[PDB]
Design an enzyme around this catalytic site. Sequence first.
Site, PDB file in Angstrom:
ATOM      1  CG  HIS A 160      -1.831   1.155   1.403  1.00  0.00           C
ATOM      2  ND1 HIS A 160      -3.174   1.105   1.096  1.00  0.00           N
ATOM      3  CD2 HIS A 160      -1.605   2.407   1.890  1.00  0.00           C
ATOM      4  CE1 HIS A 160      -3.733   2.274   1.362  1.00  0.00           C
ATOM      5  NE2 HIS A 160      -2.810   3.074   1.868  1.00  0.00           N
ATOM      6  CD  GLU A 161       1.695   3.548   3.537  1.00  0.00           C
ATOM      7  OE1 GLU A 161       1.784   4.544   2.796  1.00  0.00           O
ATOM      8  OE2 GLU A 161       0.735   3.380   4.292  1.00  0.00           O
ATOM      9  CG  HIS A 209      -0.020   6.048  -0.856  1.00  0.00           C
ATOM     10  ND1 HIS A 209      -1.172   6.500  -1.491  1.00  0.00           N
ATOM     11  CD2 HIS A 209      -0.396   5.710   0.403  1.00  0.00           C
ATOM     12  CE1 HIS A 209      -2.199   6.409  -0.655  1.00  0.00           C
ATOM     13  NE2 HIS A 209      -1.759   5.928   0.499  1.00  0.00           N
ATOM     14  CG  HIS A 248      -6.125   6.068   0.331  1.00  0.00           C
ATOM     15  ND1 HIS A 248      -6.090   6.871   1.443  1.00  0.00           N
ATOM     16  CD2 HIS A 248      -5.063   5.243   0.437  1.00  0.00           C
ATOM     17  CE1 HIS A 248      -5.057   6.547   2.187  1.00  0.00           C
ATOM     18  NE2 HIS A 248      -4.405   5.567   1.595  1.00  0.00           N
TER      19      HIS A 248
HETATM   20  C1  LIG Z   1      -2.652   8.635   6.244  1.00  0.00           C
HETATM   21  C2  LIG Z   1      -3.599   7.463   6.565  1.00  0.00           C
HETATM   22  C3  LIG Z   1      -3.939   7.495   8.069  1.00  0.00           C
HETATM   23  S1  LIG Z   1      -5.202   7.779   5.700  1.00  0.00           S
HETATM   24  C4  LIG Z   1      -6.122   6.324   6.253  1.00  0.00           C
HETATM   25  C5  LIG Z   1      -5.407   5.052   5.841  1.00  0.00           C
HETATM   26  N1  LIG Z   1      -4.041   4.954   6.493  1.00  0.00           N
HETATM   27  S2  LIG Z   1      -3.694   3.606   7.574  1.00  0.00           S
HETATM   28  O1  LIG Z   1      -4.905   3.285   8.306  1.00  0.00           O
HETATM   29  O2  LIG Z   1      -2.443   3.804   8.279  1.00  0.00           O
HETATM   30  C6  LIG Z   1      -3.368   2.289   6.438  1.00  0.00           C
HETATM   31  C7  LIG Z   1      -4.413   1.666   5.762  1.00  0.00           C
HETATM   32  C8  LIG Z   1      -4.132   0.627   4.869  1.00  0.00           C
HETATM   33  C9  LIG Z   1      -2.814   0.215   4.658  1.00  0.00           C
HETATM   34  O3  LIG Z   1      -2.407  -0.786   3.814  1.00  0.00           O
HETATM   35  C10 LIG Z   1      -3.221  -1.954   3.693  1.00  0.00           C
HETATM   36  C11 LIG Z   1      -3.144  -2.787   4.899  1.00  0.00           C
HETATM   37  C12 LIG Z   1      -3.082  -3.469   5.886  1.00  0.00           C
HETATM   38  C13 LIG Z   1      -3.005  -4.298   7.085  1.00  0.00           C
HETATM   39  N2  LIG Z   1      -4.350  -4.401   7.705  1.00  0.00           N
HETATM   40  C14 LIG Z   1      -1.776   0.854   5.349  1.00  0.00           C
HETATM   41  C15 LIG Z   1      -2.048   1.891   6.240  1.00  0.00           C
HETATM   42  C16 LIG Z   1      -3.050   6.060   6.152  1.00  0.00           C
HETATM   43  C17 LIG Z   1      -2.693   6.043   4.672  1.00  0.00           C
HETATM   44  O4  LIG Z   1      -3.480   6.376   3.788  1.00  0.00           O
HETATM   45  N3  LIG Z   1      -1.405   5.617   4.443  1.00  0.00           N
HETATM   46  O5  LIG Z   1      -1.006   5.576   3.100  1.00  0.00           O
HETATM   47 ZN   LIG Z   2      -2.724   5.130   2.258  1.00  0.00          ZN
END
Ligand SMILES: CC1(C)SCCN(S(=O)(=O)c2ccc(OCC#CCN)cc2)[C@H]1C(=O)NO
Ligand SMILES: [Zn+2]
Length: 259
Positions: A189-190, A193, A199
């Site tokens: 996920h990171e 980005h 998202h």
């Molecule tokens: C900046 C944010 C608070 S905005 C809301 C989503 N998250 S987070 O809750 O920390 C998050 C969500 C999903 C992720 O990856 C998939 C997974 C997993 C394990 N359950 C990683 C972090 C962050 C965000 O958007 N970071 O980019």
């Molecule tokens: Zn994210």
Amino acid sequence: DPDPMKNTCKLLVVADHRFYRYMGRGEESTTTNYLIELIDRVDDIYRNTAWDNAGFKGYGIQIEQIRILKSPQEVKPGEKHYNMAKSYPNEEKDAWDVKMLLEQFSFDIAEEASKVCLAHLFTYQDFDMGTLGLAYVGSPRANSHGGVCPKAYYSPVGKKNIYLNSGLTSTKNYGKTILTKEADLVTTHELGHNFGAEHDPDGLAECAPNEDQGGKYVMYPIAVSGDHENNKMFSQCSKQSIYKTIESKAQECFQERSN
Ligand SMILES: CC1(C)SCCN(S(=O)(=O)c2ccc(OCC#CCN)cc2)[C@H]1C(=O)NO
Ligand SMILES: [Zn+2]
């Protein structure tokens, strides 16, 4: 067509003392291997993704350099560092403010950041409201700061060139170590980005399928569990954003996949 010479984003991977100690059991080999394996498993997702739903695939990530930080950065009064023992700004809370940590990291790691497609910090702290990671969003724009490929911007306050080719992952949440399969997901996920994706739009059926349809994709705004098939895949929404960014940015800083 993909350029076999330009299909790999090489990483600088840092483990701070919180990761070393809790995740790596205070052992270089364990920490190192955990992270080599994690990235390799994240690489399998990327490498197998067809970004144009045809033959634009084989894009992946590999570690250029790993850095392990065994003990905290000793810090003077009024001073701060991403590897310091203290949580900033509130030292009572277990974890930094995540945005401040990524900023601190990008600042502290700037010299090394310059030589790599991306820098990624791994940590072990419990961020508020279930936050697990953070990263700058990449873009096709040459002028853009953030995500894949080092682009200097001069910081008058920091007295140096900075780079926003960076992201972070934490393996602690709600007081406990997260599952291995969850850690793969955070870093996916990171890095997602970094590679250009925002998202997933949360009401869009195609990019946020109902559970019967395989569940949500990895760029869903609320953390997916990893239990559902779609959870580790990229949506069309993410594919389209990342596709454009790769098209533009691979030539700039992607390298050949090493054996
Ligand atoms: C900046 C944010 C608070 S905005 C809301 C989503 N998250 S987070 O809750 O920390 C998050 C969500 C999903 C992720 O990856 C998939 C997974 C997993 C394990 N359950 C990683 C972090 C962050 C965000 O958007 N970071 O980019
Ligand atoms: Zn994210």
